[PDB]
Amino acid sequence: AISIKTPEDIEKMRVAGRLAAEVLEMIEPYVKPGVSTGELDRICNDYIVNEQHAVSACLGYHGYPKSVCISINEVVCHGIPDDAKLLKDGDIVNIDVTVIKDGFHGDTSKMFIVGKPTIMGERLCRITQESLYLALRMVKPGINLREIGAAIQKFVEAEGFSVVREYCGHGIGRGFHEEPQVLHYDSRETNVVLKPGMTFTIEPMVNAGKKEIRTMKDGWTVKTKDRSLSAQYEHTIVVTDNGCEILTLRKDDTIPAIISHDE
Numbered sequence: 001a002i003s004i005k006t007p008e009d010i011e012k013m014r015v016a017g018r019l020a021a022e023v024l025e026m027i028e029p030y031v032k033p034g035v036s037t038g039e040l041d042r043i044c045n046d047y048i049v050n051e052q053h054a055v056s057a058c059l060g061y062h063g064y065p066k067s068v069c070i071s072i073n074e075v076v077c078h079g080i081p082d083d084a085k086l087l088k089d090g091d092i093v094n095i096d097v098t099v100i101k102d103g104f105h106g107d108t109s110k111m112f113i114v115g116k117p118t119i120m121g122e123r124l125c126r127i128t129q130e131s132l133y134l135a136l137r138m139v140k141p142g143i144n145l146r147e148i149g150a151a152i153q154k155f156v157e158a159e160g161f162s163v164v165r166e167y168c169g170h171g172i173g174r175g176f177h178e179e180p181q182v183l184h185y186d187s188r189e190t191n192v193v194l195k196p197g198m199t200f201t202i203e204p205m206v207n208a209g210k211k212e213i214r215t216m217k218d219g220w221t222v223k224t225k226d227r228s229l230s231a232q233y234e235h236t237i238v239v240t241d242n243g244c245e246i247l248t249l250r251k252d253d254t255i256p257a258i259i260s261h262d263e
């Protein structure tokens with residue numbers, strides 16, 4: 001019973017998606033060795049509230065205490081900004097942003113590499129983004145979400161990496177999380193034929209080591225069980241009549257905003 005957005009709803013999601021992307025573009029010059037993740041989160045929240053006139057969807061959500069999630073190295077997701085935690089040379093860092101504007105959500109994340117990359121960190125981030133991009137190139141009416149999940153997993157595993165099972169992409173709109181689930185791996189349970197006007201995220205988490213994860217005792221932070229590096233990228237999109245439109249595109253993305261499968 002999946003939600004179909006109107007043209008007017010989609011325009012509001014273009015606005016909210018642009019805002020979420022713009023948080024990531026804004027924060028970039030601050031993501032440097034020696035900065036604290038607590039400071040990055042304050043910069044983001046101040047920007048969202050005071051400049052964008054929007055709200056963070058994460059703040060207070062199930063009690064989450066901060067405005068963005070900042071996940072470093074072996075942290076898979078839900079890293080909590082902390083004034084004591086300083087970024088350092090070689091770190092891979094996900095910043096995941098969700099804003100609400102005019103009732104609609106925009107949800108996106110990217111990796112930043114701090115200082116001189118490690119070769120493995122760079123490779124892991126690259127393959128993770130590539131897995132998102134290959135999925136985006138498949139989105140069009142009539143395709144099944146199952147085909148997309150299977151393709152992400154095939155691609156990632158061929159690189160000797162693994163796909164986290166637990167924290168899938170999602171429908172999004174007036175609600176933060178809506179149907180459907182967007183799995184990043186193959187499942188016989190998945191049977192969702194895309195229709196124009198569906199809006200959802202794709203947000204693969206890819207581990208350099210094994211797929212298993214662990215939640216820390218703080219009740220939020222998720223790490224790889226084997227302490228291998230983990231990376232994630234996320235975009236919010238709308239299914240169009242012949243493809244998709246990426247609502248959270250940034251200037252540094254290297255895929256077109258509008259992907260068309262028509263002749």
Ligand SMILES: COC(=O)[C@@H](CC(C)C)NC(=O)[C@H](C)NC(=O)[C@@H](O)[C@H](N)c1ccc(C(C)C)cc1
Binds near residue numbers: 058097167203
């Ligand atoms: C089983 O846990 C989950 O799947 C939950 C955790 C919440 C609902 C408690 N959902 C997620 O992690 C989803 C898949 N994450 C997402 O949709 C992320 O793109 C989104 N930017 C986000 C990040 C953090 C949180 C929590 C920590 C406040 C919520 C939402």
Ligand SMILES: [Co+2]
Binds near residue numbers: 096097098108109
């Ligand atoms: Co997100």
Ligand SMILES: [Co+2]
Binds near residue numbers: 169170201203234
């Ligand atoms: Co999301």
Ligand code: NA
Binds near residue numbers: 074075077094230
């Ligand atoms: Na990580």
